[PDB]
mmCIF file of C-alpha atoms in Angstrom:
data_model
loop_
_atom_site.group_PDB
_atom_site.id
_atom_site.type_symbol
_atom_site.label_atom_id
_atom_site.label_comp_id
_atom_site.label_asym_id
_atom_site.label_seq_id
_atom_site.Cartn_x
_atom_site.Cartn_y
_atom_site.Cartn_z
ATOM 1 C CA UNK L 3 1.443 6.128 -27.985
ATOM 2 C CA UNK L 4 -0.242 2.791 -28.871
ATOM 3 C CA UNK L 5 1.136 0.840 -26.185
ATOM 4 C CA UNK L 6 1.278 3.950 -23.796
ATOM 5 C CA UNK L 7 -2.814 4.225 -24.033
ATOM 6 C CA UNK L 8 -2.388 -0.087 -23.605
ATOM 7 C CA UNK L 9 -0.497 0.526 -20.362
ATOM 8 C CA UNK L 10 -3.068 3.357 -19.216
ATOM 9 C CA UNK L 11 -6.159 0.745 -20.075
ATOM 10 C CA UNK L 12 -4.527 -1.628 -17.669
ATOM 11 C CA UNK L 13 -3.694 1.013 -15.306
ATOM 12 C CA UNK L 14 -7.173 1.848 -15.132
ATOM 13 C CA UNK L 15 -8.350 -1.839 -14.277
ATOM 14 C CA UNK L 16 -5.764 -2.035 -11.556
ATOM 15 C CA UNK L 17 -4.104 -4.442 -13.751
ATOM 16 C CA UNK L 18 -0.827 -3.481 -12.919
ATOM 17 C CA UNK L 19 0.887 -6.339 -13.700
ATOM 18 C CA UNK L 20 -0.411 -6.511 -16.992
ATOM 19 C CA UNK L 21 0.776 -2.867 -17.742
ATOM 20 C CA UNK L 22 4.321 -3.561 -16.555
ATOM 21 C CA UNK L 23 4.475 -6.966 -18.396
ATOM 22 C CA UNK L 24 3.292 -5.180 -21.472
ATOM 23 C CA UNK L 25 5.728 -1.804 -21.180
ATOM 24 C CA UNK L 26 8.691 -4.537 -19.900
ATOM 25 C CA UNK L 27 8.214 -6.600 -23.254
ATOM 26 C CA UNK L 28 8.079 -3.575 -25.755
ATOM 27 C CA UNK L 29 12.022 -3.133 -24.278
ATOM 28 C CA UNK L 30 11.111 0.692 -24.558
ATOM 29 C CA UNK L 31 13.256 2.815 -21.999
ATOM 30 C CA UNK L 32 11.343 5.538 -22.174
ATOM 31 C CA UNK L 33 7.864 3.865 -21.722
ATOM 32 C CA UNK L 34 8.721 2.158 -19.005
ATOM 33 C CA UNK L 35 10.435 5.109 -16.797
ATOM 34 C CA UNK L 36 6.911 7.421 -17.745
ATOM 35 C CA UNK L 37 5.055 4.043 -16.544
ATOM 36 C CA UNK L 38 6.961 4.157 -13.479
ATOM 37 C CA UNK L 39 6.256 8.205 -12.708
ATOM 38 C CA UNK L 40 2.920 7.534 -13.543
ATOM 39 C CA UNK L 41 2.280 4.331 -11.087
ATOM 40 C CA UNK L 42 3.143 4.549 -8.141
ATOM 41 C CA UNK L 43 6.112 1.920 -7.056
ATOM 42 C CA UNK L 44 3.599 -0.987 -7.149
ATOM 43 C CA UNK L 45 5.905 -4.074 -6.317
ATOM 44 C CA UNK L 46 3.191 -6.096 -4.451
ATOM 45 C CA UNK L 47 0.732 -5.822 -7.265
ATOM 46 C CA UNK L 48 3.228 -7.589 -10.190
ATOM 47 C CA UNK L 49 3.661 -11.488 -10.669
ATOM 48 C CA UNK L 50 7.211 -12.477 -9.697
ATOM 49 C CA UNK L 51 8.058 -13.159 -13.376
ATOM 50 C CA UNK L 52 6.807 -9.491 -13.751
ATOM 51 C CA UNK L 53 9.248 -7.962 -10.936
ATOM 52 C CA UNK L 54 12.378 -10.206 -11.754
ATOM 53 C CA UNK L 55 12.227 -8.555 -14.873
ATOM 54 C CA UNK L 56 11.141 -5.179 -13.692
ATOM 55 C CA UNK L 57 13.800 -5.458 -11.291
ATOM 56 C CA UNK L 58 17.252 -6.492 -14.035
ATOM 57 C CA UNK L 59 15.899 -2.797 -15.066
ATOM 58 C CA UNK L 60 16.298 -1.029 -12.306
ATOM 59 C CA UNK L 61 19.805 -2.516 -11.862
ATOM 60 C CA UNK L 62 20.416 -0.821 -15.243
ATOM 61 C CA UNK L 63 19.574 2.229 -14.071
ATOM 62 C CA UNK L 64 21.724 1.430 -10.923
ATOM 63 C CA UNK L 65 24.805 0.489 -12.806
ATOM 64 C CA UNK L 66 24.326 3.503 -15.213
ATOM 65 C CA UNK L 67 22.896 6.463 -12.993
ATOM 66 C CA UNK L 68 19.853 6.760 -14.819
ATOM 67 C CA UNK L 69 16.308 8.502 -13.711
ATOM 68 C CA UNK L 70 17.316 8.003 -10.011
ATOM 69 C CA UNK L 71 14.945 10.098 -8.449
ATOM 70 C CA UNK L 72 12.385 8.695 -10.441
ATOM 71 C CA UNK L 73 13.746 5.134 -9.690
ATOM 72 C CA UNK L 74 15.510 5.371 -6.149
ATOM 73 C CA UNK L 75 11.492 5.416 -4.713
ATOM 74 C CA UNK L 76 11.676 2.007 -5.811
ATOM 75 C CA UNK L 77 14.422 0.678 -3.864
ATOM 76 C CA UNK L 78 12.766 2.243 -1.300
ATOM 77 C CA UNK L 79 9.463 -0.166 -1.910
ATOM 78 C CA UNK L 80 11.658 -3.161 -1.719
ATOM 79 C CA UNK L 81 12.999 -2.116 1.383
ATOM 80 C CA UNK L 82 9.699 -1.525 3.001
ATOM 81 C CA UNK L 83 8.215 -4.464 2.088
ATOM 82 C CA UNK L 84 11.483 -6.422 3.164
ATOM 83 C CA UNK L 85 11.133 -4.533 6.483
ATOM 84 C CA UNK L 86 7.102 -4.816 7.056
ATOM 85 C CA UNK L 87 6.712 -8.536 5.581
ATOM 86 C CA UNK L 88 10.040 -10.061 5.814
ATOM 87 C CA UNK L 89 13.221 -11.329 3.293
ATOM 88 C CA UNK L 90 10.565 -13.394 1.066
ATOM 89 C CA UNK L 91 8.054 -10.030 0.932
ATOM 90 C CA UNK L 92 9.309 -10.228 -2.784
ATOM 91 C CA UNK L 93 10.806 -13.228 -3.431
ATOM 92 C CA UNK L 94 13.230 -12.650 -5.623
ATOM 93 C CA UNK L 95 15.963 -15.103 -6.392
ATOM 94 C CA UNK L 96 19.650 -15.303 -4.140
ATOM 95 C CA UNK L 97 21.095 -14.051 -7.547
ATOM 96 C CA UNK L 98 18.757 -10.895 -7.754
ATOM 97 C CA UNK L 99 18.618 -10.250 -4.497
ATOM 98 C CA UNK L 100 22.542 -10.112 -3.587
ATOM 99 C CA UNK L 101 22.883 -8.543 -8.151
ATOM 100 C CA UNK L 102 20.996 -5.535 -6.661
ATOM 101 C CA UNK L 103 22.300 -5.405 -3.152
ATOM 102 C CA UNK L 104 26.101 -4.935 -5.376
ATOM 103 C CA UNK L 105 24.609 -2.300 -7.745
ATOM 104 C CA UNK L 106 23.449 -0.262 -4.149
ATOM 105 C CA UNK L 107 26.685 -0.429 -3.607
ATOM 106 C CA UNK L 108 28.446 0.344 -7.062
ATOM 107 C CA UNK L 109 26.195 3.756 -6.999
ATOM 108 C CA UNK L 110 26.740 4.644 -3.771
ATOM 109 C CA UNK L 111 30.698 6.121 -5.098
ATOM 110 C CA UNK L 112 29.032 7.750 -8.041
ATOM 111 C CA UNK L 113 28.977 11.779 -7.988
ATOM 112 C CA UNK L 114 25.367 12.656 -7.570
ATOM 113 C CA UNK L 115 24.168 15.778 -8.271
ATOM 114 C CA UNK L 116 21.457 15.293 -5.683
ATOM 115 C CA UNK L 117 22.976 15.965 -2.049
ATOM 116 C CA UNK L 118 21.267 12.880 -0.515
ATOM 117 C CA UNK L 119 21.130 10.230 -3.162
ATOM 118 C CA UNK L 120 24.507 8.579 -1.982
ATOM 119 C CA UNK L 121 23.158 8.764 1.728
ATOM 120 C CA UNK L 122 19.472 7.505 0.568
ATOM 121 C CA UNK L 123 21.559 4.093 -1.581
ATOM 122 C CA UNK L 124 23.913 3.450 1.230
ATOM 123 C CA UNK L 125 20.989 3.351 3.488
ATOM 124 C CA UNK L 126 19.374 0.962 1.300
ATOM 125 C CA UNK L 127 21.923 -0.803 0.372
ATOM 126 C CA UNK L 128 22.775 -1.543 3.915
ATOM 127 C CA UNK L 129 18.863 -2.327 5.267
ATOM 128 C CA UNK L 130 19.129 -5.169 2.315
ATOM 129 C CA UNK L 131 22.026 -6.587 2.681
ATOM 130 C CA UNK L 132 21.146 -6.747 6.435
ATOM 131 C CA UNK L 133 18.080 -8.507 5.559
ATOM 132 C CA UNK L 134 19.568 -10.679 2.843
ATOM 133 C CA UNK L 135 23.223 -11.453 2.855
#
């Protein structure tokens, strides 16, 4: 728990980006999904060398159906901020940007045990491509 109790320190002081950059570089799975539960999504508050990284993750968990209800919140952030502050609210590269608009789309034919998740990537998948692409 020594670089859980790091995280939480950073946390703490708001320093956000500091905690992700931290969990991101230990390559630990598990640290960063309980970093993720226990932050909000907090997109606007990470560098963009931060979220490009934070971001080839959650296209992991995309590609693999991984921790989506844990993760799916933050596709939702991106598309908020997209919506609220425009294309550039994140800028992320062209390669990120349309990389994660194809994994939306690659888990939207997945079997979901939730009901809505299919619905809730199509959705997003289509507000960011919209927006994007």
């Amino acid at each position: 728990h020594m670089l859980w109790s790091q995280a939480m320190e950073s946390v703490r002081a708001s320093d956000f980006d500091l905690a992700y950059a931290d969990i991101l570089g230990s390559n630990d799975e598990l640290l960063l999904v309980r970093l993720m539960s226990r932050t909000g999504p907090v997109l606007e508050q990470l560098s963009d060398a931060t979220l490009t990284h934070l971001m080839g993750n959650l296209k992991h968990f995309l590609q693999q159906q991984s921790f989506l209800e844990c993760v799916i919140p933050w596709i939702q952030q991106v598309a908020d901020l997209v919506l609220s502050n425009g294309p550039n609210a994140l800028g992320l590269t062209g390669d990120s940007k349309k990389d994660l608009v194809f994994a939306l789309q690659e888990a939207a034919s997945m079997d979901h045990a939730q009901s809505w998740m299919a619905a809730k990537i199509v959705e997003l998948a289509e507000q960011l491509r919209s927006a994007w692409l």
